[PDB]
């Protein structure tokens, strides 16, 4: 069986895209496994006593 | 204090102003310029624990209260040196559940390791006055013991 996601749904019900399907898609596009991340600090985290914000 | 002619130190009446040295009434100063700077947090009886909400001004500068005795010397001080400006420091001196947490927004931070251990000599506050170190505003709740009531 083949499951299609990036295709148009004639009756808006044929190919719904689940969060895990997009998860796999994104992992494949960026070349990441479950043992790494993609991370970006848009603004610097702030350290206050024994805490990181 | 109010300004009174002959009683206060002013050069008034006929030019070029005159202030008279009398016996008893003489000249008494009216007040002080910017008397709004003077604020005393008075401690009249010995207190045991307290729940203060400290509002700090400058970051990285030791912020917290210190206690003065009757001669203007320091015995104890709860002072913390934070990296960023906490919106308010919550301090509780209760023996059973001591709390020293720096709140910023909705986040609660433990301030125990950042505290000055040498300055904080005793929990028992004596007769004198409290001074605010690097604080914009302060809100205190004092609990004081009575053996029989």
Residue burial A4-41, b: 16+ Cβ < 10 Å; e: rest: eeeeeeeeeeeeeeeeeeeeeeeeeeeeeeeeeeeeee
Test B104 with A53 for CB contact under 8 angstroms.
yes
Q: Write out the two tokens for B51.
A: 């729940």
C-alpha distance from A45 to closest chain B C-alpha (Å) = 11
**Which method was used?**
X-ray
State both tokens at B30: 């009216």
User: Which residue matches tokens 């307290």?
Assistant: B50
CB-based contact A49 B107, cutoff 8 Å: no
The dihedral over CA atoms of B39, B117, B115, B49, expressed in degrees to the nearest 10, equals -60
Cross-strand pairs, B132: B65
- Quick one: which of B17, B20, B33 has its CA closest to B7? B20
**Residue of chain A whose Cα is closest to the Cα of B59:** A48
Among chain A residues, CA nearest to B86? A48
Chain B residue at shortest CA distance from A46:
B84
Dihedral of CA atoms A11, A15, A16, A17 in degrees, nearest 10, equals: -150
CB atoms within 10 A of CB B59: 14
Q: How far apart are CA A33 and CA A31, in angstroms?
A: 7
Q: In this complex, is the C-beta atom of A50 within 8 Å of any C-beta atom belonging to chain B?
A: yes
Documented resolution in Å:
5.5
């Amino acid at each position: 069986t083949i499951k299609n996601f990036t295709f148009f749904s004639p009756n808006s019900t044929e190919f719904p895209v689940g969060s895990n399907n997009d998860g796999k898609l994104y992992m494949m596009l960026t070349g990441m496994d479950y043992r790494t991340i993609r991370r970006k600090d848009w603004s610097s985290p702030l350290n206050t006593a024994l805490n990181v914000q | 204090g109010k300004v009174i002619a002959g009683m206060s130190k002013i050069y008034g009446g006929t030019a070029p102003g005159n202030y008279k040295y009398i016996k008893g009434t003489s000249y008494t100063y009216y007040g002080e310029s910017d008397i709004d700077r003077l604020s005393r947090w008075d401690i009249k009886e010995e207190i045991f624990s307290f729940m203060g909400i400290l509002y700090p001004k400058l970051p990285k500068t030791p912020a917290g209260v210190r206690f003065l005795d009757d001669i203007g010397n320091e015995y104890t001080a709860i002072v913390f040196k934070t990296e960023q400006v906490q919106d308010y420091i919550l301090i509780n001196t209760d023996v059973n559940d001591e709390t020293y947490q720096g709140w910023k927004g909705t986040t609660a931070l433990n301030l125990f390791p950042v505290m000055d251990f040498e300055r904080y000599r005793t929990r028992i506050i004596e007769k004198g006055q409290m001074e605010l170190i690097n604080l914009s505003k302060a809100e205190f709740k004092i609990k004081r013991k009575a053996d029989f009531v």
